């Protein structure tokens, strides 16, 4: 409604915060990221955005701590601010208490940071949604939204045209829990491909993939290993 | 706090096969005046962590309130037993507090022991935490806890902090520490640990003017944190030359 979307502290007659809804709308315009987890591992894959022929693809997944990583969808400046916040929180917890931070408390603090920006008219919601993959006694996937909510998932996918990925995940969810690491990586790549347009293809340049696990600190998958996995995906899809 | 006024004497904590045994006498002295004789100097932080102090009672109480509220916040945020803070976490917190106050030159006139069980794999006491009712006071055997799963840590006024298999504060650092460095051994049973601690406390009672023989023992075990019934330590002199009448010594010279 034209009269109630001017500022972020005004509810519509339906009790809606249109500015926060538009901050969320910013998320749907980003590239697709998918994250799934087995009993031991979290695999996070994403599509890197290439502006043009001569441009390098942009980063999609970032490391927060030894066993914490994130993917983002939306405004990159907001994603950077939140990433710096999370990295400093993890490092300061390690400094003060000589132990890893609790991922639930980290996500709660990030959600509070989200919320505090929606209460004043001199501020605005973050136009970025975060996917947080971590290992703290177990694999965990969190999604933080612009309005200050956070949820925990067994599989998650956001970004542009990610409903195909969601369909694939809903179809194959029962298989992820008992999967091995290779099977989980293949499943994540297959969901990303499901999102991907047919004209586009998954290559080592435009695909980002990371794993975090029991004794597996958050690590990006090397280019050679990624090429092997993509070849496997193409071969088994050819059948 | 410019200095100590009402003070508590040494505390002794040791590891034994079932957990942590920590002992302190229940006396707080206002100088040379033993004004308070039933004071509590060991506090429960949570089901696996205790804090003992030697030094100013006011600063000890301030720290105890800080730790109580830290535990309450932890419990509020807890979703699984693994979320509860550990003795190592509390030791780090207290060390940071002391370091910052040293930097401000506004110290707490205290030496602190933070002891407990650094593990959640020996019981399910933290599945449902009760703060205002102690079900312990229906008896199952204790669990043999590995020494590496136990934690005793020391913090001093300057923020110096460390951990060991046994920690002493106050005057204990001489008498009890000598006896422990001689006779302590791993996987002691409860009775052996109590006998060693009782020897140390008896020596302290004989050689320390600010101590008493009214003792409080606290056990951190798989059953949780248990306060024993305070008891009077029997302390008899070890020589008859002490009791020998002075009139039976030669009346000439300096025989006193």
UniProtKB/TrEMBL annotation, chain A:
| SMART domains, per database record | Proteasome_A_N
Task: Provide the E.C. number(s) assigned to this enzyme.
Answer: 3.4.25.1
What does UniProt give as GO cellular component?
cytoplasm; nucleus; proteasome core complex; proteasome core complex, alpha-subunit complex
Instruction: Extract the PROSITE patterns matched here.
Output: PROTEASOME_ALPHA_2
Among the GO molecular function terms of this UniProt record, one is:
endopeptidase activity
In its keyword annotation, does this UniProt entry include DNA-binding?
Answer: no
The alphabetized list of GO BP terms reads: proteasome-mediated ubiquitin-dependent protein catabolic process; ubiquitin-dependent protein catabolic process
Indicate the principal place this protein occupies in or around the cell: cytoplasm
Q: Where is the signal peptide?
A: none
Q: Which domain of life is it from?
A: Eukaryota
List, alphabetically, the Pfam families matched.
Answer: Proteasome (PF00227), Proteasome_A_N (PF10584)
| Gene3D superfamilies (UniProt xref) | Glutamine Phosphoribosylpyrophosphate, subunit 1, domain 1 (3.60.20.10)
Which segments of the protein form a coiled coil according to its record?
none
Keyword set, alphabetical order: Cytoplasm, Hydrolase, Nucleus, Proteasome
Which InterPro entries does this entry report, sorted A to Z? Answer: Ntn_hydrolases_N, Proteasome_alpha, Proteasome_alpha-type, Proteasome_alpha1, Proteasome_asu_N, Proteasome_sua/b
* Proteasome alpha-type subunits domain boundaries: 4-26
Where is this gene product found?
Cytoplasm; Nucleus
Q: Show the SUPFAM superfamilies listed in the entry.
A: N-terminal nucleophile aminohydrolases (Ntn hydrolases)
- What family, per the record? Belongs to the peptidase T1A family.
Q: What is this protein called?
A: Proteasome subunit alpha type-1, putative
Species annotation: Plasmodium falciparum (isolate 3D7)
UniProtKB/TrEMBL annotation, chain B:
An annotated GO cellular component of this protein is: proteasome core complex, beta-subunit complex
**Main localization of the protein?**
cytoplasm
**InterPro entries per the record?**
Ntn_hydrolases_N, Proteasome_beta4, Proteasome_bsu_CS, Proteasome_sua/b, Proteasome_suB-type
Q: Which Pfam families match?
A: Proteasome (PF00227)
- UniProt keyword Nucleus, yes or no: yes
| Keyword tags | Cytoplasm, Nucleus, Proteasome
Is-annotated flag, keyword Lyase? no
**Protein location:** Cytoplasm; Nucleus
* Gene Ontology BP term (one): proteolysis involved in protein catabolic process
Source domain of life: Eukaryota
- PROSITE patterns named among the record's database cross-references: PROTEASOME_BETA_1, PROTEASOME_BETA_2
Q: Could you tell me what this protein does?
A: Non-catalytic component of the proteasome.
Identify the PANTHER family for this entry.
Answer: METALLOPROTEASE TLDD (PTHR32194), PROTEASOME SUBUNIT BETA (PTHR32194:SF6)
| Family indicated by similarity | Belongs to the peptidase T1B family.
Protein name in UniProt: Proteasome subunit beta
The organism's taxonomy opens as: Eukaryota, Sar, Alveolata, Apicomplexa, Aconoidasida
């Amino acid at each position: 409604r034209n009269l109630y979307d001017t500022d972020n502290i005004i509810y519509s007659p339906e009790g809606r915060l249109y500015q926060v809804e538009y901050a969320s709308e910013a998320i749907k315009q980003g590239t697709c990221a998918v994250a799934i987890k087995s009993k031991d591992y979290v695999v996070v894959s994403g599509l890197k955005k290439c502006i043009s022929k001569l441009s390098f693809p942009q980063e999609k997944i970032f490391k927060i701590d030894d066993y914490i990583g994130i993917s983002m969808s939306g405004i990159t400046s907001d994603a950077k601010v939140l990433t710096k916040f999370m990295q400093n929180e993890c490092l300061s917890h390690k400094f003060l208490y000589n132990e890893n931070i609790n991922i639930e408390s980290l996500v709660r603090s990030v959600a509070d940071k989200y919320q505090k920006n929606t209460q004043k008219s001199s501020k605005r919601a973050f136009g970025v949604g975060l996917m947080i993959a971590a290992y703290h006694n177990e694999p965990c996937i969190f999604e933080t939204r612009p309005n200050g909510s956070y949820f925990e998932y067994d599989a998650l996918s956001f970004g542009a045209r990610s409903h195909a990925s969601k369909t694939y995940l809903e179809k194959n969810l029962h298989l992820f829990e008992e999967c091995s690491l290779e099977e989980l990586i293949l499943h994540c790549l297959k969901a990303l491909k499901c999102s991907l347009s047919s004209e586009s293809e998954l290559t080592i340049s435009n695909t980002a993939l990371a794993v975090v696990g029991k004794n597996h600190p958050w690590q990006e998958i090397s280019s050679l290993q990624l090429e092997e996995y993509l070849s496997k995906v193409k071969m088994d899809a050819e059948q | 706090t410019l200095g100590p006024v009402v003070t508590g004497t040494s505390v002794i904590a040791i590891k034994y096969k079932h957990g942590i045994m920590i002992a302190a006498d229940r006396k707080a002295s206002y100088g040379s005046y033993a004004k308070f004789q039933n004071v509590e100097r060991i506090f429960k932080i949570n089901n696996k962590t205790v804090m003992g102090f030697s030094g100013e009672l006011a600063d000890a109480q301030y720290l105890h309130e800080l730790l109580t509220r830290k535990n309450i916040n932890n419990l509020s945020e807890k979703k699984r037993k693994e979320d509860m803070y550990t003795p190592q976490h509390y030791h780090s917190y207290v060390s940071r507090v002391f370091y910052v106050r040293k930097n401000r030159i506004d110290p707490l006139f205290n030496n602190i022991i933070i002891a407990g069980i650094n593990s959640q794999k020996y019981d399910n006491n933290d599945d449902n935490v009760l703060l205002y009712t102690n079900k312990n006071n229906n008896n199952e055997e204790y669990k043999e806890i590995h020494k590496d799963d136990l934690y005793i840590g020391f913090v001093d006024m300057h923020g110096t902090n460390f951990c060991d298999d046994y920690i002493t504060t106050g005057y204990a650092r001489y008498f009890a520490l000598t006896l422990l460095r001689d006779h302590y051994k791993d996987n002691m049973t409860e009775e052996e640990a109590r006998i060693l601690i009782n020897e140390c406390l008896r020596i302290l009672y004989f050689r320390d003017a600010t101590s008493s023989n009214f003792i409080q023992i606290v056990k951190v075990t798989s059953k949780g944190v248990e306060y024993e019934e305070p008891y009077i330590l029997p302390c008899v002199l070890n020589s008859a030359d002490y009791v020998y009448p002075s009139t039976l010594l030669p009346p000439a010279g300096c025989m006193w």
